[PDB]
Amino acid sequence: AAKDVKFGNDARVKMLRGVNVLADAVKVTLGPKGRNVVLDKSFGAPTITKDGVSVAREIELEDKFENMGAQMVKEVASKANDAAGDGTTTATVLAQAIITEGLKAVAAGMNPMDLKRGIDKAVTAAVEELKALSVPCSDSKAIAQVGTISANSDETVGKLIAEAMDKVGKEGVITVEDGTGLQDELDVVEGMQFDRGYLSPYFINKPETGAVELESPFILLADKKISNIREMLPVLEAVAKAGKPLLIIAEDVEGEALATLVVNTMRGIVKVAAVKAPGFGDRRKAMLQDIATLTGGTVISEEIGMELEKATLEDLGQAKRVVINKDTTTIIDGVGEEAAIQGRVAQIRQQIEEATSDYDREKLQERVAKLAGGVAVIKVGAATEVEMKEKKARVEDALHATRAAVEEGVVAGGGVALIRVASKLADLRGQNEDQNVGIKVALRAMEAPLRQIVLNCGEEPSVVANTVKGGDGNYGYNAATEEYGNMIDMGILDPTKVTRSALQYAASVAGLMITTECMVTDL
Amino acid sequence: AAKDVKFGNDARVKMLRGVNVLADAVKVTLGPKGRNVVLDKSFGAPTITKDGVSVAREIELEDKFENMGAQMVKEVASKANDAAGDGTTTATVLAQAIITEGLKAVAAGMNPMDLKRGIDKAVTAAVEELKALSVPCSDSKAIAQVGTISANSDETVGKLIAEAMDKVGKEGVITVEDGTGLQDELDVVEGMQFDRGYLSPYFINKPETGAVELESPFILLADKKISNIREMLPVLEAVAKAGKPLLIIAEDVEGEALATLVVNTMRGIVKVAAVKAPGFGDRRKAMLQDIATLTGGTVISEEIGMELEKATLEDLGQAKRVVINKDTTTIIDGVGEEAAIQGRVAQIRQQIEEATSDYDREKLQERVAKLAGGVAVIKVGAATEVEMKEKKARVEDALHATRAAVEEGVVAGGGVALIRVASKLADLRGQNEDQNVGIKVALRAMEAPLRQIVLNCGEEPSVVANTVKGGDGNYGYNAATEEYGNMIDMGILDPTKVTRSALQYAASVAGLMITTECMVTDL
Amino acid sequence: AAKDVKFGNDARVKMLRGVNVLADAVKVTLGPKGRNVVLDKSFGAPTITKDGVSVAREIELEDKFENMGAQMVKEVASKANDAAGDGTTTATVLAQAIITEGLKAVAAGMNPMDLKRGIDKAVTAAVEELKALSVPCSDSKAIAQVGTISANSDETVGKLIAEAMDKVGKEGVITVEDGTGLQDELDVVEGMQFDRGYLSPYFINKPETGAVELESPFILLADKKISNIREMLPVLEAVAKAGKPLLIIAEDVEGEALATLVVNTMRGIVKVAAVKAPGFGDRRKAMLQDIATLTGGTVISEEIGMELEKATLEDLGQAKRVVINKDTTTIIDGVGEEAAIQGRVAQIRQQIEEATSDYDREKLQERVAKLAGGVAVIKVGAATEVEMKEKKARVEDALHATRAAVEEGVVAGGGVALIRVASKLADLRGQNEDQNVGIKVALRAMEAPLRQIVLNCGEEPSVVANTVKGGDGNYGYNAATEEYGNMIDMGILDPTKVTRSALQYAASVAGLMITTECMVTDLP
Ligand SMILES: Nc1ncnc2c1ncn2[C@@H]1O[C@H](COP(=O)(O)OP(=O)(O)O)[C@@H](O)[C@H]1O
Ligand SMILES: Nc1ncnc2c1ncn2[C@@H]1O[C@H](COP(=O)(O)OP(=O)(O)O)[C@@H](O)[C@H]1O
Ligand SMILES: Nc1ncnc2c1ncn2[C@@H]1O[C@H](COP(=O)(O)OP(=O)(O)O)[C@@H](O)[C@H]1O
Ligand SMILES: [K+]
Ligand SMILES: [K+]
Ligand SMILES: [Mg+2]
Ligand SMILES: [Mg+2]
Ligand SMILES: [Mg+2]
């Protein structure tokens, strides 16, 4: 009292109303037949939209309690979108479906801990069914279909990503850069990606991107654990007139050594970063000289007879742009060399025929692909900059979904996946009636996505849900045409990772929400 | 309680009310015998305009939801005006007629999606008859009549436009410039129009014109895909003391080179733009040298032996003004040459006697017209600058409307065209009762313009509407004189694109209003 | 008047609030450590009571949807008392528990009707099991104990009830009334007596005693008014020759006749006294025939056409002695024939079997007791009237409890009976899983009485309830001493009738109420 503090049921019922108001604004846009929501634009001509994310972002309820219910749901929905490139609205709608019955059933006096345990049991079991249902992402055709769906059925995006994957292979690194002009373009350049990131948070980027990138960086290739960089300072000072950044790749990023010294080298006013070389031992040596050829640098070490005092601006590698995150780095376009790379790749290829000792065979057979086909760079063109930004975002999210799909396969989309597994878990039961109500509420929510999508079409949801449950395999309702058919033949594919993630996160909040007992907020 | 978020009928009912206040303010002005609207002005002496556009501007409702209902209708009306030079109020009236009946039927619980589908069916069917009713703009008299009706019966404007088109021909490019004095003037100068615009948004103009124009521009006529402009900076720097702009017209506007380098050339402080030469290959060559003669330039290319290092300010063309849009370019008046053009045109005409090969016949037979009649420039004279500004604006709309009429012909004005097709489609029926009522709503709305015109005139709409439906052909009611007669002989003509466009846009909003479910607006 | 309507959970929550508000007011009285409730009555001093039904009847709530709940459960609290007297508090606690747990299961989405049938099945089995546990009660020690327990642990009341039921026998009728001493008193009446005194003081032969006593008197029963001495002469003549005294029973004695007897008595010609007939109406005729039977006399009445002028010494009844007070008449050792008296008793007992009204039925028991047993009066002693209505109510409830005990047996008190029967039904099942829940909800609620008894003491309820279920037989928890033991050795006994009654009526109401879907009532 006397502050907006309240306890027990008086708290929950405020949240319930908050979540419900948010959800009613989102679910109406779910699927391809979303029905318009109007958002006020201060200048007039209010923007008319069919996008869940664009709607859910605007809502800032004025009641300080109802706001919180909205924000925590919005929050988790966004995190599911970061795990996989879609499903913001799916997670939101599922969250309403579970939470609604959860808060009512607790208000009837059920034990909230048993409800939590019951929901968690059902969701944990269901995830195992998805693992059995998933099929591998067999071909670039599926890549295309996954792409379009992620892009509101924009075919064009899918062809680019499909084509890009054809140049560099499904697993190859793809990057997107702003439009050179009216029309899209695709090209390949001698980049270099490896699975090492920056080890210190102070190497964070200036923008909030989490990953950091350096433009026109020099590349130091120090093939030892670097106990001393003082002999590099004259080179940095000669570069300091230009300010050109330095990225460090090291056999080890020795902490009290080079890493500390680099951290001391900048007061925020020097562009430096450091990462380990990829692999271990001879692999770091090998890929350090690979990067040297790719960047036009040389390997630094005393065993090579190459002190940092000797390191000219051409013994250091160089690249036009490079990106680093918490765990990963990619060179996009090293200045590099032509014939030296061709010869080294041929030598590495020859080594594959002899370095067949299993884990050594790998290092060769990746490194050949590390040099050749460095990176493909999509250029996004549109009639105006407004569409260019829009298209770019669409492409970038579409890209993510495709990667998620190829990493963990696809399942029949359009909500059939959830309604399918719901039939198989129906026999599951808990230790007591509280858990049984927990189990039932979980399986009730799993049907909500299909029922919502169809209802938007202007259809009787009851008939379709029965028909899809009575069917078998990937038989389902194609909302885009009102025809029934096989989703895999129809190309309605959802990446398994987004569906799994959207379920787990929604259930986490619902369980997390049940066990809230007090809030402390300002008047 | 909450932010002003609200759903379903509670939202729609607000929209309906907002739309109605707007339409009732505007619809009373429709037709040549409108009724006065007293627009307020803070200085006193209110303006009392009869102009629907002027009234539509000010309407700005207090109640946020009521406001939104007005603004979206207002917006779509404006888009209709940009598509064709009239029909703002016609589109508004049709919008109100559909919306009102639509929302009523929805509130009764009619399936909203089925209602939409019904509307779009009738509109799609109806346009086919309008296509059939169109007739060619055969003669300057039809030009004039379309003009006057577009200019509130100002015969002056129709005469001016008629004369200008008689000078340069219907297809020829015409421009309007501020008055040189008390009296209107018309004259011709060596302009050149071709349907190529600037390929990058960063060449957008400073004002909001969308198109961009350059005054006293220099013209580069580069007959290759320009992979390198570095050799031009010395010429541009020599010009930078005067700041006279340079336009690049290229055989190809090379994307990653020419465009990127040009983009890099200006930091918002250099007047540079680039466009493709018209046609392909030898066509671009031909018209490039045409432009060269018209501008006093020369063709740039290594095969010609004219590097940009060699390109003086007289190998570059010059003009006093040039205009560029998203899809089209015209030079207004190149500095050019006299006898060189005359000899060139004569040669082209001679080539027409031998360029019988059709891909040449079409490439030759235009270029002759490209030289002669380059542009006509109407000067609008008036007794005051206030009348000047208003008058020019009207002339510009009459210009737009005339182009529309020549593009898609004309049909009987005064609502006769809509009420005619409405009678033909009375047999049209849909798959179910929800779609059937949807059809009835659309066919009723299409009659609204005629009944609104006559009602403003202070006559009995029942009798006139029945008489026009009992007639045949272009028979109709002349509101300016209350005589019945053949509309075409009285010159009451509307460009078909105006009627076609206004109907489709009204339907689109009406369809889009039925299927809205939620609002978001600030407190 | 305009109605208001509510649906679904928005109705049941309001209803549940009402029942709980009533039930908590009753609950607090339960068990030996329960506490008193103060009842406002506008006429005068408020009355404090422990009787659960007394409070429950007075409760009514302002909010209509809350009031509906109280007004329904009020029935169980009342009906239990009407049926069996004691045990109304228990019935209430059960009802609230079943409603709470039943409605909770409905929130899980179970079909309500299947819960109802499940509960009804569980009670039907449990009542049958109680018939197995019940053991006969007949000895004076057990009756004394069950009296004490119902009295709220007053040994004195128990002892008085045990002696009273012994003296008047099983057919005798016992009644309780407001006394005047500080200490309780028992009055016992033997033989026929009725509340009519001598019509004149001058009959008084023992003025120091203030009463008339007559030896071996003739008893004349005239079904008519005495108005003219002409009617009486032959009987007086015959009795005067016989010399035995005569008592007149008549509808009235007119002053002329009355004064003539007064002269004859004062002058010592005939010893005679006259009294009004008891009661009035047809019951007067019945009672006249009954006293006639006890005396072996004959009722002279105009309906049979008999005449007092024709009555004979053979028609009058006889008794060894009579005594009549200012307000009371008693007849000692009527010469009526035992077999005829017994046959008359059988006829009236057949009327008792036919008696549709328990109040009328009681007046018949009074008659059979007056004819063939005794009647006793218990006078409650206390210093102030608020103590009268306190003590009075508890003594009253003991009287009902002991009756039900002797006529149906006893079971271990302290609610342990319900605990021990509930465990036996663990294997009972219904036609479907919803009925299985309905069964389990019923067996769960049967623990509620024990949990409340303990909780009033401030002990931890769920530890006692667990440990009692760990035992076997009559092992239970004695709240008075806070020790475990065999309930029968402490004599903590409940008469099976009340327990069985409380269960059936509780489940009958609650098992319906949970099915409520809509409630309609006037706007406030
Ligand atoms: N042609 C289609 N038929 C049926 N369902 C579709 C079709 N295309 C997409 N969907 C479904 O739309 C859902 C996603 O809708 P969307 O508006 O992207 O919400 P979110 O952004 O939260 O994923 C997915 O479940 C997807 O399978
Ligand atoms: N003499 C006339 N008789 C009948 N209708 C006319 C006449 N002149 C113009 N109109 C009609 O007026 C309508 C447009 O009115 P206007 O005031 O221009 O509104 P808007 O500017 O929105 O078109 C056209 O449909 C046109 O055919
Ligand atoms: N000494 C005792 N120990 C434990 N339980 C007792 C004791 N005396 C009475 N009880 C129990 O308390 C209840 C009687 O209390 P009472 O206030 O009369 O409630 P009710 O009005 O429902 O009979 C019975 O269940 C009886 O078995
Ligand atoms: K959508
Ligand atoms: K007008
Ligand atoms: Mg999506
Ligand atoms: Mg107009
Ligand atoms: Mg009791």
B409: three-class secondary structure by DSSP:
coil
Q: Is the CB of C59 under 6 A from ligand 3?
A: no
- Measured CA to CA, the distance from residue C90 to residue C397 in angstroms comes to 14
Instruction: Select from B442, B443, B451, B438 the least CA-distant residue to B426.
Output: B443
Residue nearest to atom 24 of ligand 2 (CA): B414
B90: three-class secondary structure by DSSP:
helix
- Whether residues C178 and C231 fall in one domain: no
- Whether residues B107 and B160 fall in one domain: no
Residues paired with A410 in a beta bridge: A135, A495
What is the b/e burial string over B242-262, where b = at least 16 CB atoms within 10 angstroms of the residue's CB?
Answer: eeebbbbbbbbbbbebbbebb
Domain stops at, among C409, C442, C475:
C409
- Whether residues C404 and C279 fall in one domain: no
- Whether residues A163 and A247 fall in one domain: no
Closest CA in chain C for residue A441: C108
Q: Which residues surround ligand 7, an ion (CB under 5 A)?
A: B 86
- Whether residues A125 and A150 fall in one domain: no
CA B441 / ligand 5 centre spacing (Å): 27
CB A437 within 8 A of CB A445: no
- Tell whether A265 is in a known binding site: no
What is the b/e burial string over C460-473, where b = at least 16 CB atoms within 10 angstroms of the residue's CB?
Answer: ebeebbeebbeeee
Distance of CA A439 to the CA centre of its chain: 30
Nearest-10 Cα torsion for C431, C436, C441, C447 = 100
Angle at the Cα of B521 from the Cα atoms of B518 and B523, rounded to 5 degrees = 130
Per the CB < 8 Å rule, is A35 touching B75? no
Q: How far is CA C455 from CA A171, C28, C471, C475, C479, in A?
A: 70, 10, 20, 19, 10
- Whether residues C374 and C485 fall in one domain: no
CB C369 within 8 A of CB C375: yes
- Please, what is the angle between helix C461-470 and helix C448-456, to 10°? 130
**Token pair belonging to A250:** 């090291």
**Token pair belonging to B39:** 């627009």
CA B93 / ligand 5 centre spacing (Å): 14
- Measured CA to CA, the distance from residue B12 to residue B100 in angstroms comes to 11
Tell me, in Å, the resolution of the deposited structure: 3.7
- Whether residues C251 and C263 fall in one domain: yes
| Positive or negative: CA dihedral C322, C323, C326, C329 | negative
- Whether residues B119 and B241 fall in one domain: no
Domain stops at, among A366, A401, A418:
A366
- Whether residues B430 and B483 fall in one domain: yes
DSSP H or E run through B487? helix B487-490
Chains in contact with chain A (at least 3 beta-carbon pairs closer than 8 A): B, C
DSSP state of B199: S
**Token pair belonging to C276:** 């009004």
DSSP string, A409-437: -EEETTTHHHHHHHHHGGG---SSHHHHH
Atom of ligand 1 nearest to the CA of A91: 22
Q: What is the largest CA-CA distance in chain C?
A: 94
- Segments forming the whole domain that contains residue B251: 193-366
CATH number of the domain within which C11 lies: 1.10.560.10
Per the CB < 8 Å rule, is C105 touching A440? no
CA C89 / ligand 8 centre spacing (Å): 6
Upper half-sphere CA count for residue B453 (Cβ side, 13 Å) = 22
- Tell whether A330 is in a known binding site: no
CA B23 / ligand 1 centre spacing (Å): 38
- Whether residues A41 and A164 fall in one domain: no
User: E strands within C200-243?
Assistant: 212-215, 218-222, 225-226
Burial class from Cβ neighbours inside 10 Å (0-12, 13-18, 19+) for residue A243 reads: exposed
Q: How far is CA B434 from CA B126, B309, B425, in A?
A: 19, 73, 18
Angle at the Cα of A294 from the Cα atoms of A288 and A300, rounded to 5 degrees = 35
Instruction: Select from C83, C31, C72 the least CA-distant residue to C52.
Output: C31
DSSP state of B427: G
Per the CB < 8 Å rule, is A104 touching C104? no
By a Cβ cutoff of 8 Å, what residues of chain A touch chain B?
21, 24-25, 28, 33, 35-40, 44-46, 48, 55, 58-63, 66, 180-182, 185, 383-385, 457-458
Q: How far is CA B125 from CA B238, B435, B499, C330, in A?
A: 62, 14, 15, 115
Q: Give chain A's domain count.
A: 3
Q: Which residues lie below 8 Å from residue A299, measured CB to CB, with a gap of 6+? A: A221, A223, A285, A288, A289, A292, A306
Closest CA in chain B for residue A44: B71
DSSP string, C419-485: HHHHHHGGG---SSHHHHHHHHHHHHHTTHHHHHHHHHTTS-HHHHHHHHHHS-TTEEEETTTTEEE
Is B touching C (3+ C-beta pairs, cut-off 8 A)?
no
> How distant is the Cα of A46 from the closest Cα of chain B, in angstroms?
7
Instruction: Identify all chain A residues contacting C104, using CB atoms and an 8 Å cutoff.
Output: 108-110
Closest CA in chain A for residue C436: A433
Mutate to test the interface with C, among A101, A111, A433, A441 (most CBs of C within 10 A): A433
CATH number of the domain within which C146 lies: 3.30.260.10
Choice from C55, C79, C89, C505 to test ligand 3 binding pocket (greatest atom count within 8 A of CB): C89
C109: three-class secondary structure by DSSP:
coil
**Token pair belonging to A516:** 């809230």
- Tell whether B197 is in a known binding site: no
Polymer length of chain A: 523
- Whether residues C308 and C444 fall in one domain: no
- Measured CA to CA, the distance from residue B156 to residue B149 in angstroms comes to 11
Instruction: Identify all chain C residues contacting A108, using CB atoms and an 8 Å cutoff.
Output: 104, 107-108
CB A438 within 8 A of CB A122: yes
- Whether residues B518 and B420 fall in one domain: yes
Q: Which residues lie below 8 Å from residue B73, measured CB to CB, with a gap of 6+? A: B19, B22, B23, B92, B95, B96, B99, B509
CATH number of the domain within which B198 lies: 3.50.7.10
Q: How far is CA B22 from CA B73, B86, B105, C383, in A?
A: 9, 18, 21, 89
B175: three-class secondary structure by DSSP:
strand
Domain stops at, among A366, A390, A425:
A366
CB A255 within 8 A of CB A225: no
Residue type, C206: K
